[PDB]
Design an enzyme around this catalytic site. Structure first.
Site, PDB file in Angstrom:
ATOM      1  N   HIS A  45       4.046   3.244 -10.915  1.00  0.00           N
ATOM      2  CA  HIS A  45       5.054   2.225 -11.007  1.00  0.00           C
ATOM      3  C   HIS A  45       4.629   1.209 -12.839  1.00  0.00           C
ATOM      4  CE1 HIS A  45       8.085  -0.324 -10.442  1.00  0.00           C
ATOM      5  NE2 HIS A  45       7.913  -1.212 -10.894  1.00  0.00           N
TER       6      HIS A  45
ATOM      7  N   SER B 243      12.505  -1.769 -12.835  1.00  0.00           N
ATOM      8  CA  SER B 243      12.834  -2.904 -11.380  1.00  0.00           C
ATOM      9  C   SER B 243      12.825  -3.408 -11.371  1.00  0.00           C
ATOM     10  CB  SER B 243      10.501  -3.215 -11.652  1.00  0.00           C
ATOM     11  OG  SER B 243       9.802  -3.866 -10.839  1.00  0.00           O
TER      12      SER B 243
ATOM     13  N   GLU C 212       5.047   4.661  -7.413  1.00  0.00           N
ATOM     14  CA  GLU C 212       5.137   3.772  -7.216  1.00  0.00           C
ATOM     15  C   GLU C 212       4.679   3.020  -6.070  1.00  0.00           C
ATOM     16  OE1 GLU C 212       7.771   2.802  -8.955  1.00  0.00           O
ATOM     17  OE2 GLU C 212       9.104   4.388  -9.367  1.00  0.00           O
TER      18      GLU C 212
END
Ligand SMILES: *[C@@H]1O[C@H](CO[C@H]2O[C@@H](C)[C@@H](O)[C@@H](O)[C@@H]2O)[C@@H](O[C@@H]2O[C@H](CO)[C@@H](O)[C@H](O)[C@H]2NC(C)=O)[C@H](O)[C@H]1NC(C)=O
Ligand SMILES: *[C@@H]1O[C@H](CO[C@H]2O[C@@H](C)[C@@H](O)[C@@H](O)[C@@H]2O)[C@@H](O[C@@H]2O[C@H](CO)[C@@H](O)[C@H](O)[C@H]2NC(C)=O)[C@H](O)[C@H]1NC(C)=O
Ligand SMILES: *[C@H]1O[C@H](CO[C@H]2O[C@@H](C)[C@@H](O)[C@@H](O)[C@@H]2O)[C@@H](O[C@@H]2O[C@H](CO)[C@@H](O)[C@H](O)[C@H]2NC(C)=O)[C@H](O)[C@H]1NC(C)=O
Ligand SMILES: *[C@H]1O[C@H](CO[C@H]2O[C@@H](C)[C@@H](O)[C@@H](O)[C@@H]2O)[C@@H](O[C@@H]2O[C@H](CO)[C@@H](O)[C@H](O)[C@H]2NC(C)=O)[C@H](O)[C@H]1NC(C)=O
Ligand SMILES: *[C@@H]1O[C@H](CO)[C@@H](O)[C@H](O)[C@H]1NC(C)=O
Ligand SMILES: *[C@@H]1O[C@H](CO)[C@@H](O)[C@H](O)[C@H]1NC(C)=O
Ligand SMILES: *[C@@H]1O[C@H](CO)[C@@H](O)[C@H](O)[C@H]1NC(C)=O
Ligand SMILES: *[C@@H]1O[C@H](CO)[C@@H](O)[C@H](O)[C@H]1NC(C)=O
Ligand SMILES: *[C@@H]1O[C@H](CO)[C@@H](O)[C@H](O)[C@H]1NC(C)=O
Ligand SMILES: *[C@@H]1O[C@H](CO)[C@@H](O)[C@H](O)[C@H]1NC(C)=O
Ligand SMILES: *[C@@H]1O[C@H](CO)[C@@H](O)[C@H](O)[C@H]1NC(C)=O
Ligand SMILES: [Ca+2]
Ligand SMILES: [Ca+2]
Ligand SMILES: [Ca+2]
Ligand SMILES: [Cl-]
Ligand SMILES: [Cl-]
Ligand SMILES: [Cl-]
Ligand SMILES: [Cl-]
Ligand SMILES: [Cl-]
Ligand SMILES: [K+]
Ligand SMILES: [Mg+2]
Ligand code: NA
Ligand code: NA
Ligand code: NA
Ligand code: NA
Ligand code: NA
EC number: 3.1.1.8
Lengths: 527, 175, 351
Positions: free
Chosen positions: C260, C20, C147
Site C-alpha cells: 500500500h 488512500s 494492500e
C-alpha cells in the site's frame, strides 16, 4: 423563534418535537387574495404584500363544503371531515421544514382528495412533520376551492371560467417556486403527490402547459384524470350551472347576470343546492369538477394522453386492493358497516342501478356477466365481493393502469404499486378489506409513532414506504437500497410489472386485473 | 442438531443466521415456521429448482409449479400447512368423487390439474385450453417463471425462494 | 478555477488524483454537488468512499465529539458551549486525546473523518452511488497486489518487519480479533472459513498470507472494484489497473510484497531520475505510467500510443477487464478477486 423573509413579507413559525428531534412548521401562510365578493368564482388573484410579521402558527380556514353526515360519531367517516372553520376565505398553505434548516432540500407538495367537492390540508393523516423529520424533505400542502365555488363553469366567460380550484393549486406551486429557497428548499426538485381527486389533479398538472415548469415529478395515489368521475363535459357543465340558477332563483338572460345574482347568494344556499343539479347521482357523483376550459386544459384530456402531449418525467402510480368497498355503504341496498353485508343476486342488480344509473339494460347485464361467472363453491359472499370489485375496477384501478401504460409509452420511467395491507386500527369492518384512502397514513409515516398502537410490522412497512417515496422524489427511483429489499422494476407496456406493498412479502407481479380491465377499457366505453 | 447431525458448529450457526433475521413483530411462531422452512428448502425446494435450471439450460422445455392448497380433509393440524405428499390426491383426481366430502372448489382444482398433467403427457405442454385458464409459461434460466396451484387465483410468479436457495445452493455445500 | 489561467493552465481540463483517504476524497467530490463544476475527471489510487474506514455515521460522530469533551474537561450543556471550550484547548491536548474517543481501535481506525453533514454530502453515499446521483465523467481506478500487509505490523500478534512473520492458526484468530473488534464470533469464523481452505501443501506461510489478504480485500480491493462497477453502470467509461511491481528500493521486508502506497513514486515519476538507483526496467515502467496518467487527464483515455503497448480496455459490468502494471508483461485480465469479493460484498455486510 423562527422568522423567514418571503417575497410578500415575513412569516413566523413554530417548533415541534418529533422523535427526539425538531421540525419547524409554518401553518396558514396565505398565497392569494381571499376570493370574496366580486372575486367569487374567479381565478385566484395574486396577493398584495404585508408589512409586519405574519403568524403562521395554526391551521387556517378550510374552504366551503358539504360535510359527510352519514355516520355521526363514527371515526371512520368523521376523520375525513374538515377540522377547522369553513369560510370562503381559505386560500392558505402549510410548510414543514427540517431543523436545523436544510440547505437545498427536495420538496414534496401534497394535493388532498374529496371528489373535488370536499377535503382540507389540515387533516391529521396529512400532517407533514413525520416526513420532514425522518427524510429531511420539506413538505407543502395547500387548500383549494371545491364544489361550485371551485368548479362552476360557463366556459369562455371569465366571471366563471371553470377550473378555479385547479388554478388555486397552480398558484400555490408558483408560491413554492418563488419562496421555498428562503426556507432551505430546492425549487428545482419538487414532487407533487395526491390521493383520489388529489391524484387526478396531479395528473392534470402533467397535462397543463402553465404547470410544466412548476414541478419535477409526480406521484398518483388511487386517482388519475381518465377515471370516469374526474372530468365533466362542457355539456353537463352548462346544464349544471343552469340547474343551479333555477334552484337559487338566479335564472336570467345575460350569462354575466346569472353569475352576478349567484355572487349575492349566501354560501349555504349554494351548498344546499349543489346535490340537485344532477337528475340522479351515485355515491361517486362529482357535480362540479374539472372541465375543458381552453386555459388550464386546452383539449380533451384523453386526446392529450393518447398523442403524447404532456410533461416528460418519471411517475409513481398505485391503488389499493379494495378501492370500491367504502362506497357501497352510501346507498347500495343490503350493505351496512354494522353487519357482514351478504347480499343476493337481486340486490347486486339493484346495486348496479345505483352505481350505473345512465347505463342501458344491456350495459348493466354485460357487467353482471363479466363479474358473476363463479369459481365456484356456492360461497354466500360472491355477490358482495363482486359489487365492490365492480366499483373499484371501473372507478380506480383500470383507469390507473391505463394512464400508466399510455404515459410510459412515450419513453418515461414509471413505477406501479398494489397496496394490500389492512390497517390494524381500521374502524370500518373486515369485509371492507384494504380500503380506499387507507394507504395515506402509511405514506405520511403515522405508524412511525410507537406511542400510537400500530404494530411493529406496521412501523417497518411505513418506514420502507416513506423511504421509497423519498427516494422517488429526490432521485426519481423508488428503491429502498439498504435493507435487502425487493428491487422495484419499471412498468412497461408489454410486461406491466408492479410491486406489492404488504407487511409480509414484497413481490413483483405482472398484468394486474388483466381480464377485468379488458372489459372496462375496451368493451364498456362502447356501451 | 437433530436435522444436521454431521454438520460443524459454524455450519449450524450459518443456518440460524440466514433463517432468523425476523421481519419483525415478536411473533411467537417465528422459530416454528423457520424450522419447517429450513427442512423443506434444503431437502426439497432448492434441489428441485436447481435441477430445473440445469436441465432447461440444455435446450429443453420445462414447467415449474408451486402447490399451495391445503386439503379441507387434512387430518394433520393447521400449523403444518400444505404438507409434503398432499398434492398426490389432487393429481389422481380423488376430489372428482363428489360422494367424498372434498369441497366444490377442490373438485374444480383437481379437474384442472388432471387435465394439465394429461396434456403434458400427450402433448408435452401442461395447458388447460378451454376454460379461460392462466397459460403456463416455460421455465428458463434468467426469468424462472413458475405457476401457482390453488383454489382461488392461479398466478405466474418468478424466482421462487431466490434468497434461500442462494444460501443452500452456493454457500452451504462448502460447509 | 479562478487563478490557474494566469499560470498558463486550463480550468476546463482539471483532473483530481489521490491515494488512500486522498482517493476516498476524490470519490466524495464526484458525489458533492458543490464540486461538480470544479473539475473534469478523477483518478482513484487504492481508496474510495465505500471502503469501511471512509465514512463515519452520525451516531459514532456525536459519540466521538462527546467522548473528546469528557477527556478534555469540556463536557457541557449547550452544544455551542462544548465547542467554545474546545477552542480554548492547546492543539496538543486535542491531538493526545483523539486516539481514545473510540473504545477499541484497529490499525485502520479513522476516528475523525467524513460524515453525512447535509452540506458537502447530502445523503448516505452508498445511496447516491446506487441511484446514480454523481458527476458523469470518466474515471481511472486501481489497487496494489499487497494492500493489506503494511497494517499487520501495527498490532497483529506474531508479525514483525524484522523477521518472516510465519504465524500459527491461533495467531491468525487473534489477528481477526485485532482487525474486526466489533464483529460477532460467527462473523469472525466466517472469515476464517473463506480464507483458510488451503490449496494445499502444508506451506508454513499459509496463515501469514491469508491475514494480509483479508485486510487488503476488505479495506481496499473489493470496495474499489465495487465502486468501479456501480459507477460504470450509469454509462461512463472506466479503467481499472492492478499494480504488481515491488520497488527495488523498498525498505520494508519481502514478505510484505507490493505494498500500500508504493505505486505513488511511479505515478510521480521518481524513477525517471537515473542518478537515483532505481533499475532500468523501473524507469521504463514509470515512464509508461506517467504517459498513461497524462493521456487520461488530457484526453480521458489512459493509452500509451507510441511504443506497441497493450491497449487498456474499458471496465464494464459483465466483463470486468482490467490491466496489470508490472515490469515484465502488461496483461489484460478479468474479474479480479471474484470469489473474495462475493464474500466481502454480499455476505459479510449482513453479519
Ligand atoms: C345488514 O343491514 C342492512 C342495513 O339496514 C339495517 O342496519 C342493520 C344493522 C339493522 O339493524 C336494520 O335494522 C337496519 O335497517 C339490512 O338491510 C335492510 O334489510 C331490510 C329487510 O329488513 C330491507 O327492507 C331494508 O331496506 C334494508 N335497509 C337498507 C338501508 O338497505 C341487511 O339486511 C343486513 N344484513 C345482514 C344482517 O346480513
Ligand atoms: C518475529 O518477531 C516477533 C515480534 O517480536 C519480536 O521482534 C523480534 C525480531 C525479536 O527480536 C523479539 O525479541 C521481539 O519481541 C515475535 O513475536 C513475539 O513472540 C513472542 C514469543 O517470544 C511473544 O510472546 C511476543 O508477544 C511476540 N511479540 C509481539 C509484539 O507480538 C515472533 O515470534 C518472531 N517470529 C519469527 C522469528 O518467526
Ligand atoms: C339537465 O337538464 C334537466 C334539468 O332538470 C332538473 O331541474 C333541476 C333544477 C334539478 O332539480 C334536477 O333534479 C332536475 O332533474 C334534466 O331533465 C330532468 O329529467 C326529467 C326526466 O324524468 C325531465 O322530465 C325534466 O326535464 C327534468 N326533471 C324534473 C323532475 O324536473 C336533464 O336530464 C339534465 N341533463 C343531463 C343529465 O344530461
Ligand atoms: C461511545 O460511548 C461510550 C464512551 O465510553 C468511553 O469514554 C471515553 C471518554 C473513552 O475514554 C473511551 O475509551 C470509553 O470507552 C462507550 O462505552 C464504553 O464501553 C464500555 C464497555 O466495557 C462501558 O462500560 C463504558 O460505558 C465505556 N468504557 C469505559 C472504560 O468507560 C461506547 O461503547 C461508545 N459507542 C460506540 C463505539 O458505538
Ligand atoms: C404573533 O405571535 C406572538 C405570540 O408569541 C405575538 O407576540 C405577536 O404579536 C403575534 N401577532 C399577532 C397576535 O398579531
Ligand atoms: C440546489 O441544487 C440544484 C440542482 O438540482 C442547483 O442548480 C442549485 O443552484 C442548488 N442550490 C443551492 C445549494 O443553494
Ligand atoms: C350583458 O351585460 C354585461 C354586463 O352588465 C355587458 O357587459 C354585456 O355587454 C351584455 N351581454 C349580452 C350578450 O347581452
Ligand atoms: C433498515 O434496517 C434497520 C435495522 O437493521 C431499521 O432500523 C430501519 O427501519 C430500516 N431502514 C429503512 C429505510 O427501512
Ligand atoms: C371446464 O368448464 C366446465 C363448465 O363450464 C366444467 O364442467 C369443467 O370442470 C371444466 N373442464 C376442465 C378441464 O377444467
Ligand atoms: C446556548 O448558547 C448559545 C451561545 O451562547 C446561544 O446563542 C443559544 O441560544 C443557546 N442554545 C440553547 C439550546 O440553550
Ligand atoms: C517509447 O520508446 C522510446 C525509445 O524507443 C523511449 O525512449 C521512451 O521511454 C518511450 N516512451 C514512452 C512514453 O513510454
Ligand atoms: Ca384533528
Ligand atoms: Ca360525474
Ligand atoms: Ca472507523
Ligand atoms: Cl336474472
Ligand atoms: Cl406475465
Ligand atoms: Cl423478477
Ligand atoms: Cl479451531
Ligand atoms: Cl472471464
Ligand atoms: K456464510
Ligand atoms: Mg376520502
Ligand atoms: Na365518500
Ligand atoms: Na385510520
Ligand atoms: Na388425505
Ligand atoms: Na499507518
Ligand atoms: Na520508497
Amino acid at each position: 423563534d423562527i422568522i423567514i423573509a418571503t417575497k410578500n413579507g415575513k412569516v413566523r413559525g413554530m417548533q415541534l418535537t418529533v422523535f427526539g428531534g425538531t421540525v419547524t412548521a409554518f401553518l396558514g401562510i396565505p398565497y392569494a387574495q381571499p376570493p370574496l365578493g366580486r372575486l367569487r368564482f374567479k381565478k385566484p388573484q395574486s396577493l398584495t404584500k404585508w408589512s409586519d410579521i405574519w403568524n403562521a402558527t395554526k391551521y387556517a380556514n378550510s374552504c366551503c363544503q358539504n360535510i359527510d353526515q352519514s355516520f355521526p360519531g363514527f371515526h371512520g367517516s368523521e376523520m375525513w371531515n374538515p377540522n377547522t372553520d369553513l369560510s370562503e376565505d381559505c386560500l392558505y398553505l402549510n410548510v414543514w421544514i427540517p431543523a436545523p434548516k436544510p440547505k437545498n432540500a427536495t420538496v414534496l407538495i401534497w394535493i388532498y382528495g374529496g371528489g373535488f367537492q370536499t377535503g382540507t390540508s389540515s387533516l391529521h393523516v396529512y400532517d407533514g412533520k413525520f416526513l420532514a423529520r425522518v427524510e429531511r424533505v420539506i413538505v407543502v400542502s395547500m387548500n383549494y376551492r371545491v364544489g361550485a365555488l371551485g368548479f362552476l363553469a360557463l366556459p369562455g366567460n371569465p366571471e366563471a371560467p371553470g377550473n378555479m380550484g385547479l388554478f388555486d393549486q397552480q398558484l400555490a406551486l408558483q408560491w413554492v417556486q418563488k419562496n421555498i429557497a428562503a426556507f432551505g428548499g430546492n425549487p428545482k426538485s419538487v414532487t407533487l403527490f395526491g390521493e383520489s381527486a388529489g391524484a387526478a389533479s396531479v395528473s392534470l398538472h402533467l397535462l397543463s402547459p402553465g404547470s410544466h415548469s412548476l414541478f419535477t415529478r409526480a406521484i398518483l395515489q388511487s386517482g388519475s384524470f381518465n377515471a370516469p368521475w374526474a372530468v365533466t363535459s362542457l355539456y353537463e357543465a352548462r346544464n349544471r350551472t343552469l340547474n343551479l340558477a333555477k334552484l337559487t332563483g338566479c335564472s336570467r338572460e345575460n350569462e354575466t347576470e346569472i353569475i352576478k345574482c349567484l355572487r349575492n347568494k349566501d354560501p349555504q344556499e349554494i351548498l344546499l343546492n349543489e346535490a340537485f343539479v344532477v337528475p340522479y347521482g351515485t355515491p361517486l357523483s362529482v357535480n362540479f369538477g374539472p372541465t375543458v376550459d381552453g386555459d388550464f386544459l386546452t383539449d380533451m384530456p384523453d386526446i392529450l394522453l393518447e398523442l403524447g402531449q404532456f410533461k416528460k418525467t418519471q411517475i409513481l402510480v398505485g391503488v389499493n386492493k379494495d378501492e370500491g368497498t367504502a362506497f357501497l355503504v352510501y346507498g347500495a341496498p343490503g350493505f351496512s358497516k354494522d353487519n357482514n353485508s351478504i347480499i343476493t343476486r337481486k340486490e347486486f342488480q339493484e346495486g348496479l342501478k345505483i352505481f350505473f344509473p345512465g347505463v342501458s339494460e344491456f350495459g348493466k347485464e354485460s357487467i353482471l356477466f363479466h363479474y358473476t361467472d363463479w369459481v365456484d363453491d356456492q360461497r354466500p359472499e360472491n355477490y358482495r365481493e363482486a359489487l365492490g370489485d365492480v366499483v373499484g375496477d371501473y372507478n380506480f384501478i383500470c383507469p390507473a393502469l391505463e394512464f400508466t401504460k399510455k404515459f410510459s409509452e412515450w419513453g418515461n420511467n414509471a413505477f406501479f404499486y398494489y397496496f394490500e395491507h389492512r390497517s390494524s386500527k381500521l374502524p370500518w369492518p373486515e369485509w371492507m378489506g384494504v380500503m380506499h384512502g387507507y394507504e395515506i397514513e402509511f405514506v405520511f409515516g403515522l405508524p412511525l409513532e410507537r406511542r400510537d398502537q400500530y404494530t411493529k410490522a406496521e412501523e417497518i412497512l411505513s418506514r420502507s414506504i416513506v423511504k421509497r417515496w423519498a427516494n422517488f422524489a429526490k432521485y426519481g427511483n423508488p428503491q429502498e437500497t439498504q435493507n435487502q429489499s425487493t428491487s422495484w422494476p419499471v412498468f412497461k407496456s408489454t410486461e406491466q410489472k408492479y410491486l406489492t406493498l404488504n407487511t409480509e412479502s414484497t413481490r413483483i407481479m405482472t398484468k394486474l386485473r388483466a381480464q377485468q380491465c379488458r372489459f372496462w377499457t375496451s368493451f364498456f366505453p362502447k356501451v
